[PDB]
Amino acid sequence: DTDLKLVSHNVYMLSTVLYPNWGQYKRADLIGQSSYIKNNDVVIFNEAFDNGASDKLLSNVKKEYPYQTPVLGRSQSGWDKTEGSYSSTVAEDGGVAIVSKYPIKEKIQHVFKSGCGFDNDSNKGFVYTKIEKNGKNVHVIGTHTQSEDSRCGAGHDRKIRAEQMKEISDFVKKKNIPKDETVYIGGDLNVNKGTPEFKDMLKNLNVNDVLYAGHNSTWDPQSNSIAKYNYPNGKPEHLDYIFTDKDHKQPKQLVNEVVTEKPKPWDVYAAAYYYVYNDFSDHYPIKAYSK
């Protein structure tokens, strides 16, 4: 009715200056040609860091999703409001963008005030959109929260995520969005399913849990060729979600499906080594919808 089909995907579009050989441009095209990216209402991207590769990706999906936000933290242009700890002086944007098949009526970027000082060179945060479907409004917040960084510390990473999630939920409450409109909150939330922290996330984001489908992890060194390479030893975890605020209208029966679609194999002929991969990113995308 106003309920949406969404995808969220951390696309691993690292800086092509710092990480020249991660197939960023090749993957921007493959993602655009994929099936999972198609036939949704709204797509949330995370780790759209490299400006050129990210803009290519966004361009690759513009015909289907003509209404697009800028990428979080790139500049103040194109936003209805910029808030949080927005910095001109950070070399890296926040990598979050939202595209929509339906007109975006309002777009706000919020760079997180909470974070870690020895990788604070990112405008990480959330992007809020109000979207009009069938003359009615629906709200989508896309985000990407503090990674499990071995330098900041596990305990600190968890506290950072808590505060960042509270920034989102505070934003939602202060926005005074009428309770008869749904507010989706999704992205790479970096909290593993089935953990003590997971219960905290539901409270801090003010969301209900969802029904799950498909694969049982979203970052999976056992089946994903990119994750496998980077962290051969890694435990698969389920880190990407799309939830709705629990005090606003609920979808009929929200599902999060972890999609394991793979592109045709693609290579990087680095001077040092040759490598072949067959994933869009080191994370799998989530598709959310109600059946």
Separation CA 53–CA 111 (nearest Å): 21
Decide if 181 contacts 2 (C-beta within 8 A): yes
> What is the helix (H) or strand (E) element at residue 6, kind and residue range?
strand 6-13
- Smallest Cα–Cα separation from 189: which of 171, 211, 168, 215? 168
Token pair of 122, please?
């990112």
Separation CA 268–CA 254 (nearest Å): 38
Query: What is the residue-wise DSSP string for 67-131?
Result: EEPPPTTS-STT-SEEEES--SS-SB----EEEESS-EEEEEEEE-S---TTS--B--EEEEEEE
> What's the distance, CA 72 to chain centroid?
11
Please check if 257 is assigned to a binding site.
no
Token pair of 274, please?
């040759």
Token pair of 288, please?
């959310």
Phi then psi for 51, rounded to 5 degrees?
-60, -45
Residues 6+ apart with CB under 8 A from 274: 267, 268
Separation CA 244–CA 168 (nearest Å): 12
Separation CA 74–CA 49 (nearest Å): 9
Annotated binding site for Ca(2+): 47
Annotated binding site for Mg(2+): 47
Annotated binding site: 47
